[PDB]
Amino acid sequence: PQITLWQRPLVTIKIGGQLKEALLDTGADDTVLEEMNLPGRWKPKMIGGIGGFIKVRQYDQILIEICGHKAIGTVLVGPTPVNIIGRNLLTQIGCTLNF
Amino acid sequence: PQITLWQRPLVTIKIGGQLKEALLDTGADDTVLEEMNLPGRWKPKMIGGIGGFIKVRQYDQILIEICGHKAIGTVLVGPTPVNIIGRNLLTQIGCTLNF
Numbered sequence: 550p551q552i553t554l555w556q557r558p559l560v561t562i563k564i565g566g567q568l569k570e571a572l573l574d575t576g577a578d579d580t581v582l583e584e585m586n587l588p589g590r591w592k593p594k595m596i597g598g599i600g601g602f603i604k605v606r607q608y609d610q611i612l613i614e615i616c617g618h619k620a621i622g623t624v625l626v627g628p629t630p631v632n633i634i635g636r637n638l639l640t641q642i643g644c645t646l647n648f
Numbered sequence: 649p650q651i652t653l654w655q656r657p658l659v660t661i662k663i664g665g666q667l668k669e670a671l672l673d674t675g676a677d678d679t680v681l682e683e684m685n686l687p688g689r690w691k692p693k694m695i696g697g698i699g700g701f702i703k704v705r706q707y708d709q710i711l712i713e714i715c716g717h718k719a720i721g722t723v724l725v726g727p728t729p730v731n732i733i734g735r736n737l738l739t740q741i742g743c744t745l746n747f
């Protein structure tokens with residue numbers, strides 16, 4: 550699809566069999582999702598935001614569907630204002646910016 | 649142009665007589681730039697996200713040139729870790745997400 554930016558580019562994602570709303574975010578290196586249960590082990594990660602740095606849990610090789618496109622990659626879990634799909638997964642779904 | 653998301657989508661902007669590097673950020677509602685002087689009236693604003701909130705100065709009706717395209721809009725100025733071009737200006741240059 551082609552998504553304009555007059556409103557927030559919110560899409561439906563599927564993860565752990567559950568639908569969530571998430572923001573397609575070209576300014577984010579990494580995908581960060583609100584607190585949830587994910588399988589396997591996690592490792593520590595620091596991410597830097599507008600307000601400063603936060604600790605998040607890093608889960609690798611997670612199955613996630615974004616606007617119907619399947620991806621498998623790193624998902625960070627922590628206190629984010631909204632679920633965000635960052636470049637690590639935007640690249641997997643073949644997303645580009647165009648003007 | 650078509651801009652890849654393999655790397656941070658950094659572009660050159662011209663604002664207030666200055667050349668700056670800025671991130672094309674579909675996740676950001678607003679354009680936020682590191683400390684700089686701008687003409688005209690401003691009011692204080694809080695913008696938030698990962699890490700929490702920062703206080704910024706809001707300048708309206710500011711002329712910017714983004715990657716060759718002229719636009720007018722609101723520019724927030726404050727202690728952001730990176731220059732961000734938000735949706736308020738991305739729309740004006742006709743920027744879309746495609747996949």
Ligand SMILES: COC(=O)N[C@H](C(=O)NCCCC[C@@H](CO)N(CC(C)C)S(=O)(=O)c1ccc(N)cc1)C(c1ccccc1)c1ccccc1
Nearest residue numbers: 576577579596597598599630675676677678695696697698
């Ligand atoms: C007055 O209205 C608002 O405050 N709106 C917010 C806004 O537009 N602010 C711009 C945020 C700043 C942009 C942002 C990417 O888009 N960051 C990355 C930049 C520092 C490069 S970062 O948040 O620091 C972040 C860091 C790491 C990673 N991995 C991801 C993101 C909005 C929001 C959007 C996207 C991300 C965070 C917040 C928001 C929505 C809901 C509730 C509160 C706030």
